[PDB]
Design a protein around this ligand. Sequence first.
Ligand SMILES: [K+]
Ligand SMILES: [K+]
Ligand SMILES: [K+]
Ligand SMILES: [K+]
Ligand SMILES: [K+]
Ligand SMILES: [K+]
Ligand SMILES: [K+]
Ligand SMILES: [K+]
Ligand SMILES: [K+]
Ligand SMILES: [K+]
Ligand SMILES: [K+]
Ligand SMILES: [K+]
Ligand SMILES: [K+]
Ligand SMILES: [K+]
Ligand SMILES: [K+]
Ligand SMILES: [K+]
Ligand SMILES: [K+]
Ligand SMILES: [K+]
Ligand SMILES: [K+]
Ligand SMILES: [K+]
Ligand SMILES: [K+]
Ligand SMILES: [K+]
Ligand SMILES: [K+]
Ligand SMILES: [K+]
Ligand SMILES: [K+]
Ligand SMILES: [K+]
Ligand SMILES: [K+]
Ligand SMILES: [K+]
Ligand SMILES: [K+]
Ligand SMILES: [K+]
Ligand SMILES: [K+]
Ligand SMILES: [K+]
Ligand SMILES: [K+]
Ligand SMILES: [K+]
Ligand SMILES: [K+]
Ligand SMILES: [K+]
Ligand SMILES: [Mg+2]
Ligand SMILES: [Mg+2]
Ligand SMILES: [Mg+2]
Ligand SMILES: [Mg+2]
Ligand SMILES: [Mg+2]
Ligand SMILES: [Mg+2]
Ligand SMILES: [Mg+2]
Ligand SMILES: [Mg+2]
Ligand SMILES: [Mg+2]
Ligand SMILES: [Mg+2]
Ligand SMILES: [Mg+2]
Ligand SMILES: [Mg+2]
Ligand SMILES: [Mg+2]
Ligand SMILES: [Mg+2]
Ligand SMILES: [Mg+2]
Ligand SMILES: [Mg+2]
Ligand SMILES: [Mg+2]
Ligand SMILES: [Mg+2]
Ligand SMILES: [Mg+2]
Ligand SMILES: [Mg+2]
Ligand SMILES: [Mg+2]
Ligand SMILES: [Mg+2]
Ligand SMILES: [Mg+2]
Ligand SMILES: [Mg+2]
Ligand SMILES: [Mg+2]
Ligand SMILES: [Mg+2]
Ligand SMILES: [Mg+2]
Ligand SMILES: [Mg+2]
Ligand SMILES: [Mg+2]
Ligand SMILES: [Mg+2]
Ligand SMILES: [Mg+2]
Ligand SMILES: [Mg+2]
Ligand SMILES: [Mg+2]
Ligand SMILES: [Mg+2]
Ligand SMILES: [Mg+2]
Ligand SMILES: [Mg+2]
Ligand SMILES: [Mg+2]
Ligand SMILES: [Mg+2]
Ligand SMILES: [Mg+2]
Ligand SMILES: [Mg+2]
Ligand SMILES: [Mg+2]
Ligand SMILES: [Mg+2]
Ligand SMILES: [Mg+2]
Ligand SMILES: [Mg+2]
Ligand SMILES: [Mg+2]
Ligand SMILES: [Mg+2]
Ligand SMILES: [Mg+2]
Ligand SMILES: [Mg+2]
Ligand SMILES: [Mg+2]
Ligand SMILES: [Mg+2]
Ligand SMILES: [Mg+2]
Ligand SMILES: [Mg+2]
Ligand SMILES: [Mg+2]
Ligand SMILES: [Mg+2]
Ligand SMILES: [Mg+2]
Ligand SMILES: [Mg+2]
Ligand SMILES: [Mg+2]
Ligand SMILES: [Mg+2]
Ligand SMILES: [Mg+2]
Ligand SMILES: [Mg+2]
Ligand SMILES: [Mg+2]
Ligand SMILES: [Mg+2]
Ligand SMILES: [Mg+2]
Ligand SMILES: [Mg+2]
Ligand SMILES: [Mg+2]
Ligand SMILES: [Mg+2]
Ligand SMILES: [Mg+2]
Ligand SMILES: [Mg+2]
Ligand SMILES: [Mg+2]
Ligand SMILES: [Mg+2]
Ligand SMILES: [Mg+2]
Ligand SMILES: [Zn+2]
Lengths: 38, 78, 136
Amino acid sequence: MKVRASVKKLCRNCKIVKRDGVIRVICSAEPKHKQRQG
Amino acid sequence: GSTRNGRDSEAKRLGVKRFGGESVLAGSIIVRQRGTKFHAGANVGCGRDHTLFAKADGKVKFEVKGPKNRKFISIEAE
Amino acid sequence: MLQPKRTKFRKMHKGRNRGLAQGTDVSFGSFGLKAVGRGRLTARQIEAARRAMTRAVKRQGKIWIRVFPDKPITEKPLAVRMGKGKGNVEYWVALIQPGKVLYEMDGVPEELAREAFKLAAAKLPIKTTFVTKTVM
RNA sequence: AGGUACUCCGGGGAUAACAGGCUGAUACCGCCCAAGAGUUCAUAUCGACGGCGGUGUUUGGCACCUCGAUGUCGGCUCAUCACAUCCUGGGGCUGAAGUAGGUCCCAAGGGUAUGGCUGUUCGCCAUUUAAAGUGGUACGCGAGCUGGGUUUAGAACGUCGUGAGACAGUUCGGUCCCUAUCUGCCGUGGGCGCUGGAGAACUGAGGGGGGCUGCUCCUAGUACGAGAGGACCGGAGUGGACGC
RNA sequence: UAACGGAGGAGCACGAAGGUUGGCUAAUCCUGGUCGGACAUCAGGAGGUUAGUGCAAUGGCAUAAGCCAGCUUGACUGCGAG
RNA sequence: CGGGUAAGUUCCGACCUGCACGAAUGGCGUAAUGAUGGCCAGGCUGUCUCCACCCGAGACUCAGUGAAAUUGAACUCGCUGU
RNA sequence: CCGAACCGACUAAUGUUGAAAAAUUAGCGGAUGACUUGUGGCUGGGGGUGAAAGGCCAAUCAAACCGGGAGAUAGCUGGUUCUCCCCGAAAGCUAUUUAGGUAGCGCCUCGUGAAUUCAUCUCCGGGGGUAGAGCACUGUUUCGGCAAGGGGGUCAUCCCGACUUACCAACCCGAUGCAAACUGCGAAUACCGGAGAAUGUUAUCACGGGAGACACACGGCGGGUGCUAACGUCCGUCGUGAAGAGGGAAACAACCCAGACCGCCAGCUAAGGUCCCAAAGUCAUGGUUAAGUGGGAAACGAUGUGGGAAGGCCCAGACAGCGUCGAGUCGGCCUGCGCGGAAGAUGUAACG
Ligand SMILES: [K+]
Ligand SMILES: [K+]
Ligand SMILES: [K+]
Ligand SMILES: [K+]
Ligand SMILES: [K+]
Ligand SMILES: [K+]
Ligand SMILES: [K+]
Ligand SMILES: [K+]
Ligand SMILES: [K+]
Ligand SMILES: [K+]
Ligand SMILES: [K+]
Ligand SMILES: [K+]
Ligand SMILES: [K+]
Ligand SMILES: [K+]
Ligand SMILES: [K+]
Ligand SMILES: [K+]
Ligand SMILES: [K+]
Ligand SMILES: [K+]
Ligand SMILES: [K+]
Ligand SMILES: [K+]
Ligand SMILES: [K+]
Ligand SMILES: [K+]
Ligand SMILES: [K+]
Ligand SMILES: [K+]
Ligand SMILES: [K+]
Ligand SMILES: [K+]
Ligand SMILES: [K+]
Ligand SMILES: [K+]
Ligand SMILES: [K+]
Ligand SMILES: [K+]
Ligand SMILES: [K+]
Ligand SMILES: [K+]
Ligand SMILES: [K+]
Ligand SMILES: [K+]
Ligand SMILES: [K+]
Ligand SMILES: [K+]
Ligand SMILES: [Mg+2]
Ligand SMILES: [Mg+2]
Ligand SMILES: [Mg+2]
Ligand SMILES: [Mg+2]
Ligand SMILES: [Mg+2]
Ligand SMILES: [Mg+2]
Ligand SMILES: [Mg+2]
Ligand SMILES: [Mg+2]
Ligand SMILES: [Mg+2]
Ligand SMILES: [Mg+2]
Ligand SMILES: [Mg+2]
Ligand SMILES: [Mg+2]
Ligand SMILES: [Mg+2]
Ligand SMILES: [Mg+2]
Ligand SMILES: [Mg+2]
Ligand SMILES: [Mg+2]
Ligand SMILES: [Mg+2]
Ligand SMILES: [Mg+2]
Ligand SMILES: [Mg+2]
Ligand SMILES: [Mg+2]
Ligand SMILES: [Mg+2]
Ligand SMILES: [Mg+2]
Ligand SMILES: [Mg+2]
Ligand SMILES: [Mg+2]
Ligand SMILES: [Mg+2]
Ligand SMILES: [Mg+2]
Ligand SMILES: [Mg+2]
Ligand SMILES: [Mg+2]
Ligand SMILES: [Mg+2]
Ligand SMILES: [Mg+2]
Ligand SMILES: [Mg+2]
Ligand SMILES: [Mg+2]
Ligand SMILES: [Mg+2]
Ligand SMILES: [Mg+2]
Ligand SMILES: [Mg+2]
Ligand SMILES: [Mg+2]
Ligand SMILES: [Mg+2]
Ligand SMILES: [Mg+2]
Ligand SMILES: [Mg+2]
Ligand SMILES: [Mg+2]
Ligand SMILES: [Mg+2]
Ligand SMILES: [Mg+2]
Ligand SMILES: [Mg+2]
Ligand SMILES: [Mg+2]
Ligand SMILES: [Mg+2]
Ligand SMILES: [Mg+2]
Ligand SMILES: [Mg+2]
Ligand SMILES: [Mg+2]
Ligand SMILES: [Mg+2]
Ligand SMILES: [Mg+2]
Ligand SMILES: [Mg+2]
Ligand SMILES: [Mg+2]
Ligand SMILES: [Mg+2]
Ligand SMILES: [Mg+2]
Ligand SMILES: [Mg+2]
Ligand SMILES: [Mg+2]
Ligand SMILES: [Mg+2]
Ligand SMILES: [Mg+2]
Ligand SMILES: [Mg+2]
Ligand SMILES: [Mg+2]
Ligand SMILES: [Mg+2]
Ligand SMILES: [Mg+2]
Ligand SMILES: [Mg+2]
Ligand SMILES: [Mg+2]
Ligand SMILES: [Mg+2]
Ligand SMILES: [Mg+2]
Ligand SMILES: [Mg+2]
Ligand SMILES: [Mg+2]
Ligand SMILES: [Mg+2]
Ligand SMILES: [Mg+2]
Ligand SMILES: [Mg+2]
Ligand SMILES: [Zn+2]
């Protein structure tokens, strides 16, 4: 998991989702792309 | 360290002493100046330091005259 | 790093930075990066943004810098007390007011100019906006 | 014209040295952009040129408190808090086969060396440990101890000076007071109350203490691995330090 | 109108570089011209004060306060409205 | 650099790059001497690991005597802020 | 030489309102000598004496003690005693062996005298070079055009030169900025003068008696300095504190409201407020927020949510899903409120 102030789609398979007040990036293709804003 | 500056001269209190329309006695200084920013008109003299002073009693009058659009000071007899 | 080749005087009063800018139109190219905020642009910042711009367009087209850092900035060295004269000139800045066009570009597609200007704006301390030439 | 550390008086927190305060350039810790390094691949891990903050921990700026006195560096004794976590606990990614690592997130319950040198703090070194955390507390703690260092009077060296003398240069020597009123804290009683008086046994609102961890063995030379090597999960035993 | 704010000068010179009368007008460049050249003196043109001012800077200066010449001592003494 | 120590900013022996030794405000040595400065070892130990117990004099209680510094006035709590 | 008496005083503990204004206890040095001790004598204060420490000279020593000059002087610190009434500063300028002192002036008070004297507003007469603006000038700056020239080369080379530029390009022309020490422009205000009304306890000026004061502070605006750091520092100008109580800002000289002659168990308001602490709307109407945001913060990140103006595609079947399916769909712009970014030390502790 990457924890950053700037979270973005890194590839066409990344998806932005907000879970319990936290913006996250979840990617079906690449575990390295998983992010949470913080 | 230290500074190479720190000098100045005393202020000379130049400028206009009597403005347009003011009644003055002969001898009154009207303007103190370096060089002739203002020029002497009727009933006004120009001193050695280019002071303009009244040569007659009357009212101060400023005007722009001549081919160079120069500013002249004169005294209107009252 | 831009800097006047010579100046009448070495040091300058702090001054202030009020008002809106002059030079608010794209005047030389077709696209511009315009300042929205107010501030100072150091010569290092102007150059860091120029480099990022220029590498993004692969040194194609043409680039104008509409601002020049002509104001010297002094600093007092560390562990020095107040007084004993004005400090030494350390860097140069340009004063920026809202509306100032900072850079202009020509000879590239608009989509590429937008991307190049975005990379440059990330080097600058002031908020900016992308503008295009207008006929009037 | 100078010296005074042999010194003296009148004054000042109108004005410096300590600590506090304001500030945060500097310092430290985060973050943004992504040139590139990484065979390929910016983002496993680093991150150039530049940008934005946080802390109040450094070096400083200021001169607001104290000059009718707010005792200093280090050690000793006793601590208490923060978390930006050193160990132990939980987790995501890995350029994570395993073992062992890298990086980030959560987490402050408890734990967190002895020595040689030097006044040292620090540091280097030796040998340990699961680890030998980082900071705040008047750089915590001298009405609790020390007094090696700094910083009186003696003396000398180098050096400067014609000299008296001087040097965050060095060197040998050099008095550390206080019977606790109040707050606080550790203990221990007396009074009255609790609604007739008395002797017992309780309930438990609330408060405090405690909370560390090694190694060996089994699982199993199994999973993993070409080998070398070598586990998770689970179970058993026996220690270190601490406490009663 | 302040600061151990930012920049420069003075501690003189001149019996003409003072008075007055009469006259005059700059820098720089281009072209042609013996020695002669980037630059000497000559001629013409462009230009219009970009020069000049005994010495800093500012304000002035063509009616010149700038440049030249003749004659001179007002670089006079006592006073002085304002 | 060598020695001593598991480990030695001190000590001893050297080197010479003497910031800034040097010849009677003496130079270099020197047996003996010193409540003199530094360093090492044997012995010795409560100095220490890490304190335990004991004997006395106080401290504590009772009777007698009976001070002191200090003190604007006090019905004299914690925390966070001001 | 070892060691008692005797003479000393190296170490430690105690003691430090002591048993003692220098000791006690355990150890320590000299102990036939430059030794130690009794009695008496001599040296006197810029003087003595000193195996030298500025040591000692009666518990006193870088000039003893006592008395006198003497109430030295003290631009320094402290202190300065009954009552009421009226007015009421300054912390500036200039000079100063001056800087925390003082003097003249400014500002306070008391008295006398003299002008519609002074102020506010309106109108009239004035100079201006700040703000802003601009770029002819002084400088600085970028791009293009032209190009003297310069340089780098291909030959040529005795002199010539012929070309060419990786080229550099001044001048001039066109376009773009910047200036406290730039100005071919140029305000608002402020200031000087004149005229007119109303208002104001002469508020103005002069002379005279008496001063205090010459450490200022914060806040606003315009600035220098510093880091557009400081509850920093130095000016200008206004306000308040000083020397000013009351109400508000939890508490809070200097901010907001407002100037306390005395009494009242009357009334209306200001700033700020009206759910409870705690006086007054759990008021009315229409919206927004879901974060306890409100009640701490940035670059930057994001299908949070409200509003607005356009645009693309779409029953000729879009967008998503898998030719099918049958009504909307997509992503820019602007804008309101919110979200992450966000770690600190005694105790919640960043709405009192
Ligand atoms: K002296
Ligand atoms: K001395
Ligand atoms: K900061
Ligand atoms: K800060
Ligand atoms: K951060
Ligand atoms: K003090
Ligand atoms: K601690
Ligand atoms: K851990
Ligand atoms: K991990
Ligand atoms: K913990
Ligand atoms: K030591
Ligand atoms: K050290
Ligand atoms: K302290
Ligand atoms: K002590
Ligand atoms: K201490
Ligand atoms: K104390
Ligand atoms: K108390
Ligand atoms: K507990
Ligand atoms: K003449
Ligand atoms: K003449
Ligand atoms: K001698
Ligand atoms: K000798
Ligand atoms: K001795
Ligand atoms: K010896
Ligand atoms: K004798
Ligand atoms: K003597
Ligand atoms: K005596
Ligand atoms: K004497
Ligand atoms: K005075
Ligand atoms: K008076
Ligand atoms: K009237
Ligand atoms: K007017
Ligand atoms: K210009
Ligand atoms: K002010
Ligand atoms: K007042
Ligand atoms: K809240
Ligand atoms: Mg002047
Ligand atoms: Mg200004
Ligand atoms: Mg001495
Ligand atoms: Mg004293
Ligand atoms: Mg301090
Ligand atoms: Mg500090
Ligand atoms: Mg002070
Ligand atoms: Mg001050
Ligand atoms: Mg204090
Ligand atoms: Mg006191
Ligand atoms: Mg104290
Ligand atoms: Mg944490
Ligand atoms: Mg806890
Ligand atoms: Mg628990
Ligand atoms: Mg040893
Ligand atoms: Mg030692
Ligand atoms: Mg301390
Ligand atoms: Mg500490
Ligand atoms: Mg203490
Ligand atoms: Mg004690
Ligand atoms: Mg000592
Ligand atoms: Mg001694
Ligand atoms: Mg003590
Ligand atoms: Mg009881
Ligand atoms: Mg507990
Ligand atoms: Mg003034
Ligand atoms: Mg002044
Ligand atoms: Mg003439
Ligand atoms: Mg002449
Ligand atoms: Mg060695
Ligand atoms: Mg060694
Ligand atoms: Mg040696
Ligand atoms: Mg010598
Ligand atoms: Mg010598
Ligand atoms: Mg000799
Ligand atoms: Mg000699
Ligand atoms: Mg000699
Ligand atoms: Mg000798
Ligand atoms: Mg002896
Ligand atoms: Mg008793
Ligand atoms: Mg003796
Ligand atoms: Mg004895
Ligand atoms: Mg002997
Ligand atoms: Mg003996
Ligand atoms: Mg005498
Ligand atoms: Mg001495
Ligand atoms: Mg004596
Ligand atoms: Mg004397
Ligand atoms: Mg006398
Ligand atoms: Mg006296
Ligand atoms: Mg009054
Ligand atoms: Mg004098
Ligand atoms: Mg004084
Ligand atoms: Mg301007
Ligand atoms: Mg008027
Ligand atoms: Mg004074
Ligand atoms: Mg003053
Ligand atoms: Mg002032
Ligand atoms: Mg200001
Ligand atoms: Mg300022
Ligand atoms: Mg201040
Ligand atoms: Mg300030
Ligand atoms: Mg006062
Ligand atoms: Mg008040
Ligand atoms: Mg109040
Ligand atoms: Mg109040
Ligand atoms: Mg009412
Ligand atoms: Mg109520
Ligand atoms: Mg909040
Ligand atoms: Mg936010
Ligand atoms: Mg807490
Ligand atoms: Zn992805």
